[PDB]
Design a protein around this nucleic acid. Structure first.
Ligand SMILES: [K+]
Ligand SMILES: [K+]
Ligand SMILES: [K+]
Ligand SMILES: [K+]
Ligand SMILES: [K+]
Ligand SMILES: [K+]
Ligand SMILES: [K+]
Ligand SMILES: [K+]
Ligand SMILES: [K+]
Ligand SMILES: [K+]
Ligand SMILES: [K+]
Ligand SMILES: [K+]
Ligand SMILES: [K+]
Ligand SMILES: [K+]
Ligand SMILES: [K+]
Ligand SMILES: [K+]
Ligand SMILES: [K+]
Ligand SMILES: [K+]
Ligand SMILES: [K+]
Ligand SMILES: [K+]
Ligand SMILES: [K+]
Ligand SMILES: [K+]
Ligand SMILES: [K+]
Ligand SMILES: [K+]
Ligand SMILES: [K+]
Ligand SMILES: [K+]
Ligand SMILES: [K+]
Ligand SMILES: [K+]
Ligand SMILES: [K+]
Ligand SMILES: [K+]
Ligand SMILES: [K+]
Ligand SMILES: [K+]
Ligand SMILES: [K+]
Ligand SMILES: [Mg+2]
Ligand SMILES: [Mg+2]
Ligand SMILES: [Mg+2]
Ligand SMILES: [Mg+2]
Ligand SMILES: [Mg+2]
Ligand SMILES: [Mg+2]
Ligand SMILES: [Mg+2]
Ligand SMILES: [Mg+2]
Ligand SMILES: [Mg+2]
Ligand SMILES: [Mg+2]
Ligand SMILES: [Mg+2]
Ligand SMILES: [Mg+2]
Ligand SMILES: [Mg+2]
Ligand SMILES: [Mg+2]
Ligand SMILES: [Mg+2]
Ligand SMILES: [Mg+2]
Ligand SMILES: [Mg+2]
Ligand SMILES: [Mg+2]
Ligand SMILES: [Mg+2]
Ligand SMILES: [Mg+2]
Ligand SMILES: [Mg+2]
Ligand SMILES: [Mg+2]
Ligand SMILES: [Mg+2]
Ligand SMILES: [Mg+2]
Ligand SMILES: [Mg+2]
Ligand SMILES: [Mg+2]
Ligand SMILES: [Mg+2]
Ligand SMILES: [Mg+2]
Ligand SMILES: [Mg+2]
Ligand SMILES: [Mg+2]
Ligand SMILES: [Mg+2]
Ligand SMILES: [Mg+2]
Ligand SMILES: [Mg+2]
Ligand SMILES: [Mg+2]
Ligand SMILES: [Mg+2]
Ligand SMILES: [Mg+2]
Ligand SMILES: [Mg+2]
Ligand SMILES: [Mg+2]
Ligand SMILES: [Mg+2]
Ligand SMILES: [Mg+2]
Ligand SMILES: [Mg+2]
Ligand SMILES: [Mg+2]
Ligand SMILES: [Mg+2]
Ligand SMILES: [Mg+2]
Ligand SMILES: [Mg+2]
Ligand SMILES: [Mg+2]
Ligand SMILES: [Mg+2]
Ligand SMILES: [Mg+2]
Ligand SMILES: [Mg+2]
Ligand SMILES: [Mg+2]
Ligand SMILES: [Mg+2]
Ligand SMILES: [Mg+2]
Ligand SMILES: [Mg+2]
Ligand SMILES: [Mg+2]
Ligand SMILES: [Mg+2]
Ligand SMILES: [Mg+2]
Ligand SMILES: [Mg+2]
Ligand SMILES: [Mg+2]
Ligand SMILES: [Mg+2]
Ligand SMILES: [Mg+2]
Ligand SMILES: [Mg+2]
Ligand SMILES: [Mg+2]
Ligand SMILES: [Mg+2]
Ligand SMILES: [Mg+2]
Ligand SMILES: [Mg+2]
Ligand SMILES: [Mg+2]
Ligand SMILES: [Mg+2]
Ligand SMILES: [Mg+2]
Ligand SMILES: [Mg+2]
Ligand SMILES: [Mg+2]
Ligand SMILES: [Mg+2]
Ligand SMILES: [Mg+2]
Ligand SMILES: [Mg+2]
Ligand SMILES: [Mg+2]
Ligand SMILES: [Mg+2]
Ligand SMILES: [Mg+2]
Ligand SMILES: [Mg+2]
Ligand SMILES: [Mg+2]
Ligand SMILES: [Mg+2]
Ligand SMILES: [Mg+2]
Ligand SMILES: [Mg+2]
Ligand SMILES: [Mg+2]
Ligand SMILES: [Mg+2]
Ligand SMILES: [Mg+2]
Ligand SMILES: [Mg+2]
Ligand SMILES: [Mg+2]
Ligand SMILES: [Mg+2]
Ligand SMILES: [Mg+2]
Ligand SMILES: [Mg+2]
Ligand SMILES: [Mg+2]
Ligand SMILES: [Mg+2]
Ligand SMILES: [Mg+2]
Ligand SMILES: [Mg+2]
Ligand SMILES: [Mg+2]
Ligand SMILES: [Mg+2]
Ligand SMILES: [Mg+2]
Ligand SMILES: [Mg+2]
Ligand SMILES: [Mg+2]
Ligand SMILES: [Mg+2]
Ligand SMILES: [Mg+2]
Ligand SMILES: [Zn+2]
Lengths: 50, 87, 155
RNA sequence: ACUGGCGAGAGACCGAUAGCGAACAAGUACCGCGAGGGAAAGAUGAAAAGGACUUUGAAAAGAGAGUCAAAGAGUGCUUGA
RNA sequence: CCCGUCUUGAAACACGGACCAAGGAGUCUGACAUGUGUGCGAGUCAACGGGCGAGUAAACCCGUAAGGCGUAAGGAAGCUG
RNA sequence: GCAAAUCGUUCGUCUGACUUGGGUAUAGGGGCGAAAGACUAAUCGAACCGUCUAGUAGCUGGUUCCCUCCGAAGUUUCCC
RNA sequence: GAUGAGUAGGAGGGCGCGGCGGUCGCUGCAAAACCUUGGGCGCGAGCCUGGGCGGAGCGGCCGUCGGUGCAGAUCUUGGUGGUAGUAGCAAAUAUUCAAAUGAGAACUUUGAAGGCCGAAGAGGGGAAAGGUUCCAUGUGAACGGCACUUGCACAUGGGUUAGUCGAUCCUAAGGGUCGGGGGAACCCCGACAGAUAGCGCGUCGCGCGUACUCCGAAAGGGAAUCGGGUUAAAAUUCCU
RNA sequence: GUCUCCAAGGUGAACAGCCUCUGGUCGAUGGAACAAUGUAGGCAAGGGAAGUCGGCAAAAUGGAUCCGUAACUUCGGGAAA
RNA sequence: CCAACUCAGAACUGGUACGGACAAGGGGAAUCCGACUGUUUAAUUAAAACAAAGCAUUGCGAUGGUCCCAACGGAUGUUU
RNA sequence: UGUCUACUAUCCAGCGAAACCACAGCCAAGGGAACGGGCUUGGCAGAAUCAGCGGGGAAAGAAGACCCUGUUGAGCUUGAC
RNA sequence: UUCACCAAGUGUUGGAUUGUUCACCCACCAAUAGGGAACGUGAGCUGGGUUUAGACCGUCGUGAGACAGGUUAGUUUUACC
RNA sequence: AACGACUCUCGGCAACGGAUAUCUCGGCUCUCGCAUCGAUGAAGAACGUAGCGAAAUGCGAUACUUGGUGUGAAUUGCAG
């Protein structure tokens, strides 16, 4: 809600940063096996649980 | 009404985030974490959950300080000295 | 790459293929079954008439529950037929692509006929649908691979 | 004495549905208010040399061509029931 | 007549089985017993341990009043044998 | 099935033992019950989670290669 | 020379799988696996071989060993059919015309018309709960159970401004506690077994002094902000 | 399923129903036919519960004004008899 | 001089139509049960079941009655 | 019994499941585990397909809750131990 | 009117009370015969009865509870093969 | 009762699927050595940190590292 604590807002900020595609140059490294971001989260599909 | 209709009333949180363990397990009214028993001084651990023990035991985290003890032991915890300057 | 059947005269034939096309396999098979051994000019007009609902594509194998129409009696006596425009659209594009390949090879387009055409099932795509009593069932699509070969009519 | 910790050697052991749950961003993704529950997922090639260019198509892509011993190895690609 | 199965009796209006791949069930250990193979024989057994040794978890050696089983039985026992 | 209890019409009550939000107290042989063994997170004539646990089963099901030879019993006695 | 049935059951001789100790070999002039309307051997388990595919390992024989042989277990995991282009898309009155844009328009946008919600609303806000879904631009696929040029999807960037609005302060039901009393201990009771906290006034001294300076309300109590204007998205917060 | 604030005009006793203004919206995949059976909504000659376990379902009554209102009664009611 | 809308009556008039849509009791004579209002088996039973006011019985004057607690203590009790 | 309206069904474009499935699917009698789609003897029997239908498939849904057995429980009761 | 023969072609009804099968009565009629088809027929209906869980009475039992005794309320699923 | 459709069947090819074979910076088992957490703030939790990074790994506003020493010419997906 609009009324939120500082602690919760900080946690939500970190989750937004983590919810991005992997950089393209990561897949061109030597011996790379990372195909995509396996931890992508959508606000409507999976909830944060807090 | 016990089924779908009852699930519509889910806007009061029993648990919040624990200050100590970070799980959404801090029972608000009991002021007690169901995961680590915070604010009790001793952590919550039970031998009847082998999996629970190994999820939270030493080494599952950062080992910020304990990771460097073996290195210092090999040198006999030497301190207050430095390698001789290169010639 | 490799087609299930090779043309008798590779120099006098052209070909085109499509993979994982989002169109019903069963509908596309019926459309292909109606075009086999057909002149290219007639096949194109026949498919255009299907898009205009003037000619029907008979359904012979995957025909359970298919309606009956007079437009299919000439090719299918019992009258089972339909107008699968989506299947016709994909096949029409393939015919045009094969025709362009013929022009590059300098073939006689007027004498071309469909010497080979087949539809294969592609990988199924997965969605889901919601059922009574909180149950989830599969909601799948059935795409198909299409390959065709046009050969010149030898005198 | 020693199925923990750190370091080391070994085996008539398992060989990706096996072997630890986990050979891989695995106690991860995900589920549960919570105590807890808990997966799937390894293999291009010697070397990316990862397919220039022509032509058709709105595009995906196809046709021809090109690289390679091999595309009948073409980025979930060895073999392929 | 359809296989598998329990049954006096199954093609059964008895049950399991839509189809394919792979996984999938008398094992290990202790005690005893009969039988058989082998060694030695009124003896037998290197078993805890020691001496060593393929630089060595093996192999080889060691039983000096050790110990186990056997070499004598009967009796509740004192005992006799 | 829109739905693991909903939809339509029809119905009970509607200033009170009235309806309702949030806060707070009561926890498993315990709670709570204007009492139906009701309710205690779709779980209640004893919740849920892990463990003891690979619990025991005179009962049901299954129990994996080939030929060759021999080849039964449903009878006796005793047994909660 | 005689003789031949066999469930439950017993036994013998053999087949096959994977290691180990040995021994004899094969293989990039093509091993394993797999495929075959090729051929042959054995009563049979199986075995040998032609051709194909594949591209780096493998086999025979003696002994010895074992997580060693499947059609079934409403068997386990994975995959795949028939059913079937079938059941099905039907509540909440409703769309139509023209033009623009686009490869593509019953579904996007503009205009016109015809309807609906009808102020206890299908309107305008907020508390919980969610957490970027907000705004702009763009978009291959997937997704929005038809479609989409569309977007609560995807990609890039932007966005939340307070002495006056709240939290914060106060106390409520209650919660957490000192000392004390219990308790093997985890814990139980909770200001009840006690030299309280300190405060006030002078300038360190006098006076007072009944055991919690604790937590507990974004609907209870409560110091103070009003117009006008401003953004693609913010305001009783920015500007005047 | 989920707490609460603001609440126009007409009809009318009325934040009843019906229609309208502000604001919002045509979002429920579309097209063509008009069989049976179905779901929802109706109507019907004459008879009027003969139907059926049973008047289930439906129909009938319904607002307001004036008149009038029995048994019984705890004297309050019954009564909108 | 300025007023709002309640009531009552009369004439005339329409194919007797007029609470014209919407809205909105069927009525009566009895039997059984429960006095009534209230409550109840969330998701097959709403009732004659529960509760209820009224009535009656029982314990107890605090060194107490009833009850909780492993122990210490505590609820009724800010009570009589 | 008839008839009227709407939405379905029906036909089309697009989209698109599941239950269930030994193999399968025309009958009569016979015998049979005493009620066969299969066996015996007969009747017969002609591609493919559409809309409906509830006779049969002893149809599906679930290791009968009734009853009995087990040296299985559990709730409750008391003059059981 | 009775007995018997060929004879199953046609017909064998409307109601009160009862969940009933059965029965009984009223009335009509030429007549109101008797039966089978998994005691035909619940994916055809209906659910009155019986036969879960709520509740009341009587009798029985110290009690929990019992009653081929009475009473009232009690979800009837799926076809597209 | 041709042809063709349909169904079934056999073969070639193409699909579907991921078995088999060959692999393995992993697992499992045995043996050996060592004794070293924390109020001098541990284990654990949170947030931040790179020219281009989300995770994993590393690190702590000196933040994928400072300093000393050793080694002696790279790092590398791109840029500089
Ligand atoms: K049809
Ligand atoms: K696993
Ligand atoms: K290859
Ligand atoms: K059986
Ligand atoms: K049986
Ligand atoms: K069977
Ligand atoms: K001896
Ligand atoms: K010795
Ligand atoms: K004696
Ligand atoms: K009401
Ligand atoms: K319990
Ligand atoms: K037995
Ligand atoms: K060998
Ligand atoms: K062969
Ligand atoms: K061997
Ligand atoms: K809110
Ligand atoms: K403030
Ligand atoms: K407040
Ligand atoms: K107040
Ligand atoms: K201002
Ligand atoms: K109809
Ligand atoms: K009647
Ligand atoms: K009332
Ligand atoms: K007391
Ligand atoms: K269609
Ligand atoms: K028969
Ligand atoms: K019980
Ligand atoms: K039926
Ligand atoms: K009822
Ligand atoms: K064929
Ligand atoms: K393998
Ligand atoms: K610290
Ligand atoms: K360094
Ligand atoms: Mg949600
Ligand atoms: Mg969760
Ligand atoms: Mg419940
Ligand atoms: Mg709570
Ligand atoms: Mg607290
Ligand atoms: Mg149909
Ligand atoms: Mg659905
Ligand atoms: Mg649901
Ligand atoms: Mg150790
Ligand atoms: Mg594994
Ligand atoms: Mg394997
Ligand atoms: Mg290789
Ligand atoms: Mg491959
Ligand atoms: Mg029997
Ligand atoms: Mg049998
Ligand atoms: Mg039978
Ligand atoms: Mg059985
Ligand atoms: Mg079965
Ligand atoms: Mg196998
Ligand atoms: Mg012996
Ligand atoms: Mg001795
Ligand atoms: Mg003697
Ligand atoms: Mg709908
Ligand atoms: Mg207690
Ligand atoms: Mg209550
Ligand atoms: Mg009861
Ligand atoms: Mg459990
Ligand atoms: Mg077992
Ligand atoms: Mg005895
Ligand atoms: Mg024999
Ligand atoms: Mg072998
Ligand atoms: Mg074959
Ligand atoms: Mg061999
Ligand atoms: Mg092994
Ligand atoms: Mg095995
Ligand atoms: Mg198998
Ligand atoms: Mg078997
Ligand atoms: Mg199975
Ligand atoms: Mg399966
Ligand atoms: Mg299927
Ligand atoms: Mg349909
Ligand atoms: Mg529908
Ligand atoms: Mg329609
Ligand atoms: Mg509608
Ligand atoms: Mg629309
Ligand atoms: Mg309306
Ligand atoms: Mg309106
Ligand atoms: Mg209001
Ligand atoms: Mg769509
Ligand atoms: Mg938006
Ligand atoms: Mg997004
Ligand atoms: Mg304020
Ligand atoms: Mg208080
Ligand atoms: Mg406490
Ligand atoms: Mg203390
Ligand atoms: Mg005191
Ligand atoms: Mg304070
Ligand atoms: Mg406070
Ligand atoms: Mg306030
Ligand atoms: Mg705003
Ligand atoms: Mg008025
Ligand atoms: Mg109104
Ligand atoms: Mg009538
Ligand atoms: Mg009439
Ligand atoms: Mg009348
Ligand atoms: Mg009647
Ligand atoms: Mg009748
Ligand atoms: Mg009657
Ligand atoms: Mg009625
Ligand atoms: Mg009356
Ligand atoms: Mg009486
Ligand atoms: Mg009452
Ligand atoms: Mg209730
Ligand atoms: Mg109920
Ligand atoms: Mg009810
Ligand atoms: Mg009285
Ligand atoms: Mg005590
Ligand atoms: Mg028959
Ligand atoms: Mg049968
Ligand atoms: Mg025959
Ligand atoms: Mg036929
Ligand atoms: Mg039907
Ligand atoms: Mg039937
Ligand atoms: Mg069956
Ligand atoms: Mg059974
Ligand atoms: Mg059972
Ligand atoms: Mg038993
Ligand atoms: Mg017995
Ligand atoms: Mg018991
Ligand atoms: Mg007759
Ligand atoms: Mg009979
Ligand atoms: Mg019957
Ligand atoms: Mg039937
Ligand atoms: Mg039925
Ligand atoms: Mg019946
Ligand atoms: Mg009934
Ligand atoms: Mg009952
Ligand atoms: Mg009595
Ligand atoms: Mg009854
Ligand atoms: Mg790092
Ligand atoms: Zn915690």
């Amino acid at each position: 809600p609009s009324h939120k604590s500082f602690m919760i807002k900080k946690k939500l900020a970190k989750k937004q940063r983590q919810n991005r595609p992997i950089p393209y140059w990561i897949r061109m490294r030597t011996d790379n096996t990372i195909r995509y971001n396996a931890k992508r989260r959508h606000w409507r599909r999976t909830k944060l649980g807090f | 009404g016990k089924g779908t209709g009852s699930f519509g009333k889910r806007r009061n949180k029993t648990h919040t985030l624990c200050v100590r363990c970070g799980r959404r397990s801090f029972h608000l009214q009991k002021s007690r974490c169901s995961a680590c028993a915070y604010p009790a001084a001793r952590l919550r651990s039970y031998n009847w959950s082998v999996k629970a023990i190994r999820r939270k035991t030493t080494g599952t985290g950062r080992m910020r300080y304990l990771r460097n003890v073996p290195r210092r032991f090999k040198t006999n915890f030497r301190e207050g000295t430095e390698a001789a300057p290169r010639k | 790459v490799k087609y299930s059947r090779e043309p008798d005269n590779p120099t006098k034939s052209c070909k085109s293929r499509g993979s994982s096309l989002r169109v019903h396999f069963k509908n596309t098979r019926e459309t292909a079954h109606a075009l086999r051994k057909m002149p290219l000019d007639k096949a194109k007009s026949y498919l255009e008439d299907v898009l205009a609902h003037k000619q029907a594509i008979p359904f012979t194998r995957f025909c359970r529950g298919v309606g009956r129409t007079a437009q299919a009696k000439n090719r299918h006596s019992n009258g089972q037929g339909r107008w699968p425009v989506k299947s016709a659209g994909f096949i029409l594009d393939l015919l045009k692509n094969a025709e362009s390949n013929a022009e590059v090879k300098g073939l006689d387009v007027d004498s071309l006929y469909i010497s080979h055409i087949q539809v294969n099932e592609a990988q199924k795509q997965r969605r889901r649908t919601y059922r009574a009593h909180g149950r989830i069932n599969p909601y799948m699509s059935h795409p198909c691979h299409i390959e065709l070969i046009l050969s010149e009519k030898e005198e």
